[PDB]
Scaffold this active site. Structure first.
Site, PDB file in Angstrom:
ATOM      1  N   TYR A  75      -3.711 -12.156   8.610  1.00 44.57           N
ATOM      2  CA  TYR A  75      -3.885 -11.827  10.019  1.00 44.57           C
ATOM      3  C   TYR A  75      -4.381 -12.957  10.906  1.00 44.57           C
ATOM      4  O   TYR A  75      -4.431 -12.763  12.123  1.00 44.57           O
ATOM      5  CB  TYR A  75      -4.815 -10.611  10.147  1.00 44.57           C
ATOM      6  CG  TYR A  75      -4.231  -9.518   9.300  1.00 44.57           C
ATOM      7  CD1 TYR A  75      -3.114  -8.814   9.733  1.00 44.57           C
ATOM      8  CD2 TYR A  75      -4.717  -9.265   8.018  1.00 44.57           C
ATOM      9  CE1 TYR A  75      -2.526  -7.850   8.946  1.00 44.57           C
ATOM     10  CE2 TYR A  75      -4.138  -8.292   7.214  1.00 44.57           C
ATOM     11  CZ  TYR A  75      -3.042  -7.592   7.689  1.00 44.57           C
ATOM     12  OH  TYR A  75      -2.446  -6.629   6.911  1.00 44.57           O
ATOM     13  N   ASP A 131      -4.122 -12.799   3.570  1.00 46.09           N
ATOM     14  CA  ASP A 131      -5.387 -12.377   4.142  1.00 46.09           C
ATOM     15  C   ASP A 131      -6.583 -12.745   3.279  1.00 46.09           C
ATOM     16  O   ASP A 131      -7.712 -12.444   3.677  1.00 46.09           O
ATOM     17  CB  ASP A 131      -5.406 -10.861   4.459  1.00 46.09           C
ATOM     18  CG  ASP A 131      -4.715  -9.994   3.409  1.00 46.09           C
ATOM     19  OD1 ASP A 131      -4.338 -10.481   2.311  1.00 46.09           O
ATOM     20  OD2 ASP A 131      -4.564  -8.778   3.709  1.00 46.09           O
ATOM     21  N   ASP A 173      -2.329 -10.813  -2.127  1.00 44.62           N
ATOM     22  CA  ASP A 173      -2.960 -10.216  -0.958  1.00 44.62           C
ATOM     23  C   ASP A 173      -4.401  -9.868  -1.303  1.00 44.62           C
ATOM     24  O   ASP A 173      -4.699  -9.497  -2.439  1.00 44.62           O
ATOM     25  CB  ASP A 173      -2.166  -8.965  -0.542  1.00 44.62           C
ATOM     26  CG  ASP A 173      -2.625  -8.376   0.786  1.00 44.62           C
ATOM     27  OD1 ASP A 173      -3.696  -7.711   0.807  1.00 44.62           O
ATOM     28  OD2 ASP A 173      -1.874  -8.524   1.783  1.00 44.62           O
ATOM     29  N   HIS A 188       0.809  -1.215   0.000  1.00 48.52           N
ATOM     30  CA  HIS A 188       0.000   0.000   0.000  1.00 48.52           C
ATOM     31  C   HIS A 188       0.843   1.266   0.000  1.00 48.52           C
ATOM     32  O   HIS A 188       0.294   2.351  -0.214  1.00 48.52           O
ATOM     33  CB  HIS A 188      -0.945   0.045   1.217  1.00 48.52           C
ATOM     34  CG  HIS A 188      -2.003  -1.017   1.202  1.00 48.52           C
ATOM     35  ND1 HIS A 188      -2.886  -1.170   0.152  1.00 48.52           N
ATOM     36  CD2 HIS A 188      -2.307  -1.990   2.093  1.00 48.52           C
ATOM     37  CE1 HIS A 188      -3.690  -2.191   0.399  1.00 48.52           C
ATOM     38  NE2 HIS A 188      -3.360  -2.706   1.571  1.00 48.52           N
ATOM     39  N   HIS A 214      -6.085  -7.398  -0.594  1.00 42.52           N
ATOM     40  CA  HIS A 214      -6.272  -5.978  -0.870  1.00 42.52           C
ATOM     41  C   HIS A 214      -5.502  -5.565  -2.116  1.00 42.52           C
ATOM     42  O   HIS A 214      -4.465  -6.141  -2.448  1.00 42.52           O
ATOM     43  CB  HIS A 214      -5.809  -5.121   0.312  1.00 42.52           C
ATOM     44  CG  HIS A 214      -6.499  -5.444   1.596  1.00 42.52           C
ATOM     45  ND1 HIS A 214      -5.959  -6.289   2.541  1.00 42.52           N
ATOM     46  CD2 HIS A 214      -7.701  -5.051   2.082  1.00 42.52           C
ATOM     47  CE1 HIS A 214      -6.791  -6.389   3.564  1.00 42.52           C
ATOM     48  NE2 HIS A 214      -7.857  -5.651   3.310  1.00 42.52           N
TER      49      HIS A 214
HETATM   50  O1  LIG Z   1      -2.592  -4.303   4.713  1.00 45.81           O
HETATM   51  C1  LIG Z   1      -3.704  -4.743   5.024  1.00 45.81           C
HETATM   52  N1  LIG Z   1      -3.973  -6.116   4.838  1.00 45.81           N
HETATM   53  O2  LIG Z   1      -2.991  -6.910   4.291  1.00 45.81           O
HETATM   54  C2  LIG Z   1      -4.749  -3.836   5.648  1.00 45.81           C
HETATM   55  C3  LIG Z   1      -4.591  -2.435   5.618  1.00 45.81           C
HETATM   56  C4  LIG Z   1      -5.533  -1.574   6.207  1.00 45.81           C
HETATM   57  C5  LIG Z   1      -6.686  -2.056   6.870  1.00 45.81           C
HETATM   58  C6  LIG Z   1      -7.703  -1.120   7.508  1.00 45.81           C
HETATM   59  N2  LIG Z   1      -8.952  -1.742   8.004  1.00 45.81           N
HETATM   60  C7  LIG Z   1     -10.067  -1.791   7.032  1.00 45.81           C
HETATM   61  C8  LIG Z   1     -10.703  -0.396   6.783  1.00 45.81           C
HETATM   62  O3  LIG Z   1     -10.646   0.332   7.998  1.00 45.81           O
HETATM   63  C9  LIG Z   1      -9.061  -2.253   9.357  1.00 45.81           C
HETATM   64  O4  LIG Z   1      -8.083  -2.176  10.104  1.00 45.81           O
HETATM   65  C10 LIG Z   1     -10.367  -2.913   9.920  1.00 45.81           C
HETATM   66  C11 LIG Z   1     -10.445  -3.270  11.425  1.00 45.81           C
HETATM   67  C12 LIG Z   1      -9.678  -4.315  11.980  1.00 45.81           C
HETATM   68  C13 LIG Z   1      -9.753  -4.644  13.351  1.00 45.81           C
HETATM   69  C14 LIG Z   1     -10.607  -3.935  14.215  1.00 45.81           C
HETATM   70  C15 LIG Z   1     -11.379  -2.897  13.686  1.00 45.81           C
HETATM   71  C16 LIG Z   1     -11.295  -2.577  12.317  1.00 45.81           C
HETATM   72  C17 LIG Z   1      -6.843  -3.453   6.907  1.00 45.81           C
HETATM   73  C18 LIG Z   1      -5.893  -4.323   6.313  1.00 45.81           C
HETATM   74  K   LIG Z   2      -3.793  -7.992  -4.310  1.00 51.50           K
HETATM   75 ZN   LIG Z   3      -4.016  -7.097   2.725  1.00 49.42          ZN
END
Ligand SMILES: O=C(NO)c1ccc(CN(CCO)C(=O)Cc2ccccc2)cc1
Ligand SMILES: [K+]
Ligand SMILES: [Zn+2]
Ligand SMILES: [K+]
Ligand SMILES: [K+]
Length: 355
Positions: A304, A264, A171, A133, A173
């Protein structure tokens, strides 16, 4: 015919001082490493040392201002780490974050070097924080510097500027930073599979849609495979590889393959919501090994569920070591067929193998 592995427990020092249960946990990498030991994969690998990326190396993809800002976090008090992290979308910072990000990138450089000098055929990099990202000028989504993008440029810096690098990003995302860094580049083919949900899924930009095919001389060299309509798994990922990833990759004929290997999209991941199994990731890896004379570097991104990522990445390393792929046609979700055909339509002007 040797597989390299890089892992350094000092990358565990990056942590969230305000929320110790934040999912991008230090033990992500130690659990993956432990599982490699338990499955007796570690002793079969050639251990590649971690090192720090240099600031000059970071400037292969990132602005001097961005490098200087993240470097300055090394000496910040908590209040200012909180303030700086809040300037970005979904970032937390500790005094150790900059050094860990340097080690993640430097580990991948040493792995790419080991492949390109012939010391190993392929390699796996158990690294954090993730990278895909991160943009030229900003941090994002738990990522500070774009490790995979930097590794492609580092590979070109020790061979030739036009070395053909394929980056496969599985990934869950979209790798927004990787897409943007290479959007005008025909030397680096970026292929991403990602949950999209018409922009409702992180990172919430239409940049991730199938019609974003690259710019200028890079037109055709950005392949977005966006999923809509809930849970996808092995059937959908195998079909996307069959119809899209592998035909395009063969036509591109990469000289090095980098995998932005987030886990993920795995069964059990609370953030991704998908159901790719460890056997599925094994089959994806085995297909990519047919490219670039087997020169493949698997780079940990997200993922995760500690048990899920440990079993899934270990299965990938087992494939790199030459183990036979495990047994795994279930009909695709209807919306996955729609997605695949949208991408085929978008890229048939650029890739004869799709016509
Ligand atoms: O790099 C990533 N995955 O590989 C990644 C990057 C950013 C996010 C952000 N995200 C989704 C939108 O807010 C979150 O963190 C969602 C969350 C997780 C735990 C508790 C409350 C909320 C989630 C995942
Ligand atoms: K991807
Ligand atoms: Zn991701
Ligand atoms: K584009
Ligand atoms: K590109």
């Amino acid at each position: 015919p040797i597989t390299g592995l890089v892992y350094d427990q000092r990358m565990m020092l990056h942590h969230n001082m305000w929320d110790s249960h934040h999912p991008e946990l230090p033990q992500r990498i130690s659990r993956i490493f432990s599982r490699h030991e338990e499955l007796r994969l570690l002793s079969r690998c050639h251990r590649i040392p971690a090192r720090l990326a240099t600031e000059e190396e970071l400037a292969l993809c990132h602005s001097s201002k961005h490098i200087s800002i993240i470097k300055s976090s090394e000496h910040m008090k908590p209040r200012d780490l909180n303030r700086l992290g809040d300037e970005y979308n979904s970032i937390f910072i500790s005094n150790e974050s900059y050094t860990c990000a340097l080690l993640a990138a430097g580990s991948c450089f040493n792995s790419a070097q080991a492949i390109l000098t012939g010391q190993v055929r392929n390699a796996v990099a158990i690294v954090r924080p993730p990278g895909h990202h991160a943009e030229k000028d900003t941090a994002c989504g738990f990522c500070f510097f774009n490790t995979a993008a930097l590794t492609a440029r580092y590979a070109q810096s020790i061979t030739r500027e036009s070395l053909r690098v394929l980056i496969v990003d599985w990934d869950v995302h979209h790798g927004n930073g990787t897409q943007h860094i290479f959007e005008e580049d025909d030397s680096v083919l970026y292929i991403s599979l990602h949950r999209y949900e018409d922009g409702a899924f992180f990172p919430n930009s239409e940049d991730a849609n199938y019609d974003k095919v690259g710019l200028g001389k890079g037109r055709g060299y950005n392949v977005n495979i966006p999923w809509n309509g809930g849970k996808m798994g092995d059937p959908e990922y195998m079909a996307a590889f069959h119809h899209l990833v592998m035909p395009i990759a063969r036509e591109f004929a990469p000289e090095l393959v980098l995998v932005s290997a987030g886990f993920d999209a795995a069964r059990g991941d609370p953030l991704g919501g998908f159901q790719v199994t460890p056997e599925g990731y094994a089959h994806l890896t085995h297909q990519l090994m047919s490219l670039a004379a087997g020169r493949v570097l698997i780079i940990l991104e997200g993922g995760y569920n500690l048990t899920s990522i440990s079993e899934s990445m270990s299965m990938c390393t087992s494939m790199l070591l030459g183990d036979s792929p495990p047994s795994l046609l279930t009909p695709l979700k209807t919306s996955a067929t729609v997605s695949i055909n949208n991408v085929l339509r978008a890229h048939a002007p650029f890739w004869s193998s799709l016509r």
